[PDB]
C-alpha cells in the first residue's frame, strides 16, 4: 500500500463483508476435531458442502464436511447421482446419496461470495472516483502566460498567498507576434460530487446486505430459506449417522 | 468473472429470484421417493406438469410428476386429448385424462420463469449503465496541448496533485503555424445518474414480485389463482389414485 | 512543521484514531510483567497474536503475547500447522496449536490499522484542499496594465484601501501599438467550498468509526464479532495454562 494514486482497497471490503456473511448461523453439537466455522465456510464459498465419514487413515478425522463438486450424471428430475469432496491438498472420489449428505446454502447452490465479489469491485471504484474528484477541486482554473508575465504574477502572489499560483508558460503565446493577450485563463472546474458519492456507497451497502439476508420482508425471507435448507440437512445427518447435530440463527454472537 | 468492463451478472439475479419463485407452495403427503420441490420445479419451469403411475421397470419410482407437453389434437372446447411427460434423458408417450392428471400453475399455463428471464436481462443492463456512468465521472474535461506545453502542465500538477492531469498531445495543435492557442479544453462532462438508476432497479424488482404474486389486491389475487389450480389438481390425484396429497401456501418456511 | 503550504497532518489523525481503536477491550487478570495494552496492540496492528510460555532465559518473562505470522503449511480446512511470534529485536520459531494459542481480532485476521491508514490519507487531502480553496478566495480578479497605468491605479487605492491592488504589468499590453485597452481584467474567481469540505470530513469520520465498531445494528454487530473471538481465545488460554484471564468491553474507561 502507500503508493501515489492507488490503494489496496479490495481487501478492506472483502474481508469485512466476509466476516458478516460467515456469522449468520451456528452449529452446536459436532464430531471430534470439527468446528462450526468449517461447515459455514464451505457453504459460504461454494454454496454447497458434503458431510461424510472418513476412510483414509492418514487424515486425523472421524467425519469431514467439505465443499462439494457433483458428477455430471443425474436422475429423471436432474438430481446428481454422485458427490465429490474437495479439500486443501486433497480430493475424495465419488461419494453417494446412500453414504453422504449434501448440504445447500440455498436451493440453486448459489455461493454467497459471488455477491460480495461484485460489490467489493464496485465500492473500490467509488473510492477511486471520490479521490480523483477531490484532487480535481484544487485546480478550477489554469493560467497560460509569457515567461516574463509568469514571473510578474509569482511576485503578486508572494505578497499575500500561502501557495504558488496555477500558472505556466505557453510556448505559442510566448512565440507569436501581433494579437494574443500574454495571459489566457482556461476553465478546468470539475463538478462537486463528494456528498453524492458517499450516498451511493451507502445505497450499495444496503443492496449487498439484502442479498445476504443480514439487514424487511425480503430480508427475512432470504434468511428463512437459508435456515430451512440447514434444518433439512441437519435431520438427514442425524438419521444417517446418529450424531445429534443442531443448527441455529445468530440473533446475538454471545449467548449471555 | 473478474474481467475488465464485464461481470457474470445474469446468474446472481436469475438464481436469487428463482429461489423465491420455487418457495410459494408446499406439498405435504407424497408417494415414496418423491419431494415437494420436484412438483414445484415442473410448475415453475414449464407452467404445467403431468402426474402418473410409472410402468417402465428400469426406473425406481412408483409415481412420477414431470413437465407436460400436450399433443396437437383437442375436443370441441380446445382441451388436449393426450399428454406427454418429459424427463431428463427420458420421454413418456401419450398419457391421457383417463389415466393421468395435468396440473397447471395458472389457467393459461404461462411459466413463471418467463417473467424472471425478462427482468434478469433488464437488471443486468441497469448494472452495466451504473458502471459506465460511474467511470465517466472521472473525466469531466480533457486538455489538448503541444508536446512542450504538456510537459509544463505535468510539472504544475506534480507540486500538489495525487494523480496525473487529463492532458494529451494534439497533432493538429502541435503542427499548425499562426493562430490556435497551444492548449484547448474539450468538455466531456456526463450527467450524474447513480441515484436515479438505483431507484429504477428497485421499481423493476417490485414489478417482478407482483407478476410472481410474492410481495396488494392484485398480488393476493395472483397467488389465490395459483393456489386454486393446485387444490383442484390435488383432489383429482386423490380421487384417481387414493394418495391423500395436500398442498399449502408458505406463509413461513419453518413451521415452528 | 511550520513550513509554507504544508503541514505534518498525518500524525494528528493517525495517533488520535489509534488511541480510540486501542481502547475497545480490557484484559483483567494477567501473568507477571504483562499489561492489557500489550495484547491489544498486537491485535490492533497485525490482526492476530500468539500467546505462549517463554523458554529463552535471557528474556525476563514467564509468558509472552506477540503479533503472529503463520507458516505456509495447512490442514484439509486451511488452518495453518505452526505459528511464529514476532518481537522487537526478537523472533520465536515455529510454535504450534499443541503448545500456544492464536488470538484473532476478527475471523479473517484483518488488522484494524488498515482502516485508519486509508482514512488518515483521505483526511490529510481534505485539509490540503480546504487550505488551497481558502487561499484562492483572496484573488477573484487580476488586472493586467501598462507600467504607467499600474502606477496610476496604486494611487487610486492608496486613498481609501488597506491593501495593495491585484495589478501587474502585461508586456504584450505595454509593447503593442494600435488596439488593446491598456487595462484588462482576467476573472480568476474559484467556487466557495469550505462549508461542503467540512461536511465531507465529518462523513468520512463516521465511516471510519463504523469499520472500528466504535460509534447502529452494523456497529454493534462489528463489536460483537470482535468480542466473541476474544472470549473464545480467553477460555483456550485458561484451559492450556490455568491462568484465569478475563476480557471485557470498555463501556467507560474508569470503573467508578
Author numbering:
A (entry chain B), B (entry chain A), C (entry chain C): 28 to 242, 261 to 301
From the manuscript:
The Portal Protein (PP) complex is a central component of Caudovirales virions in the process of self-assembly of phages. The PP has multiple functions: (1) as a nucleation point for capsid formation; (2) as part of the motor for loading the genome into the capsid; (3) as a head-full sensor; and (4) as a conduit for genome translocation. All portal protein primary structures are characterised by a common fold comprising four conserved domains: The capsid-facing C-terminal crown, the interior wing and stem, and the tail-facing clip domains. Using cryoEM, we determined the structures of two portal proteins: GA1 gp10, and phiCPV4 gp17, which are phages of the Salasmaviridae and Guelinviridae families respectively. Both GA1 gp10 and phiCPV4 gp17 PPs have the canonical fold and domain organisation found in the portal protein phi29 gp10.
The phiCPV4 phage belongs to the Guelinviridae family and infects Clostridium perfringens, a pathogenic scourge of the poultry industry, which causes foodborne illnesses in humans. Guelinviridae infecting Clostridium species also cluster together (in yellow) with the phiCPV4 PP (gp17) sharing 28.7% sequence identity with phi29 gp10. The height and diameter the phiCPV4 gp17 dodecamer are 82 Å and 158Å. In phiCPV4 gp17 the N-terminus could be traced from residue Val23 and forms the α1 helix similar to that of phi29 gp10 and GA1 gp10. Likewise, monomers of phiCPV4 gp17 are held together by 4 hydrogen bonds between the α3 helices: Gln152A, Tyr145A, Lys165B, Asn158B, where A and B designate adjacent subunits. Interestingly, in phiCPV4 gp17 the β-sheet of the clip is formed by three strands β8, β9, and β10 of the same subunit. In phiCPV4 the inter-monomeric interactions occur between α4 (Asn176B, Met180B, Leu183B, Tyr184B) and β9 (Leu195A, Val196A, Glu198A) of the adjacent subunit. The insertion of the Lys-Leu-Ala-Glu-Ala motif (residues 197–202 forming helix α4′) followed by the loop Gln-Ala-Leu-Gln-Glu, makes the link between β9 and β10 bigger, allowing them to form a common β-layer. The inter-monomeric interactions are located between β9 and α4 in phiCPV4 gp17, which is different from all other PPs; while in phi29 and GA1 gp10 it is the β8 and β9 from adjacent subunits that make the more typical inter-monomeric interactions. This is an unexpected observation, since all other Caudovirales PPs described to date have the β-sheet of the clip domain formed by strands from adjacent subunits.
